[PDB]
Paper text:
Because W99 had the highest SAP value among the residues in CDR3, we hypothesized that W99 of sdAb B is a key residue for surface hydrophobicity. Therefore, we prepared an sdAb B mutant that possesses the W99A mutation (denoted as sdAb B YERLA mutant, the terminal A corresponds to W99A). The elution volume in SEC indicated that sdAb B YERLA was eluted as a monomer, even without the addition of Arg. This result suggested that the W99A mutation successfully reduced the surface hydrophobicity of sdAb B and improved colloidal stability. To confirm that the mutations did not alter the overall structure of the sdABs, we conducted X‐ray crystallographic analysis for both sdAb A YERLS and sdAb B YERLA. The crystal structures of these mutants were determined at 1.57 Å and 1.62 Å resolution, respectively. We were unable to assign the residues in CDR3 of the sdAb B YERLA mutant structure due to the weak electron density. This result suggests high flexibility of the CDR3 loop, even though its length is relatively shorter (10‐residues) than the average CDR3 length. In contrast, the W99A mutation in sdAb B CDR3 resulted in an increase of T m and ΔH values. To create sdAb B YERLA, we mutated W99 in the center of CDR3, which might be involved in the direct interaction with the antigen.
Single domain antibodies (sdAbs) can be generated from variable regions of heavy‐chain antibodies, which lack light chain and CH1 region. In this study, we obtained two sdAbs (sdAb A and B) with VH‐like hallmark residues and low solubility from an alpaca immune library. To obtain sdAbs against Nlgn2, we prepared the extracellular domain of Nlgn2 as a recombinant protein and immunized an alpaca with it. We employed site‐directed mutagenesis and introduced all four VHH‐like mutations (V37Y, G44E, L45R, W47L) into the hallmark residues in FR2 of both sdAb A and B (denoted as sdAb FR2 YERL mutants) and prepared the FR2 YERL mutants as recombinant proteins.
Residue numbers in the entry: 1 to 101, 105 to 119
Amino acid sequence: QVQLVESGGGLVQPGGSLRLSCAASGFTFSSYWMYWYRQAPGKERELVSGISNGGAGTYYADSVKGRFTISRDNAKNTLYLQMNSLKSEDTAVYYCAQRGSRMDYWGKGTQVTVSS
Ligand SMILES: [Cl-]
């Protein structure tokens, strides 16, 4: 069975950093683009970042460019999101996802709270 498990969330002050990890299981990880999404309870789901099969291509929401960096380890089957220069607006549940090559797969999410 496919499973995605996010970790690395927490409570930090504006300007601080976190690193999210997404431990993937139960599929051929390196055959897929992998993604981070987020949702703040008041708001709609938003794509945060994506990374190509082997990592040469990346995509970022304009609002996270220069702050967040997506990367992956195709042997450890782990996706990462380095989050620097955190802002209040970044407070959200963060979810990793595989969106196929037609099934979608989602983790249960990790809470990031940016607050003084
Ligand atoms: Cl928290």
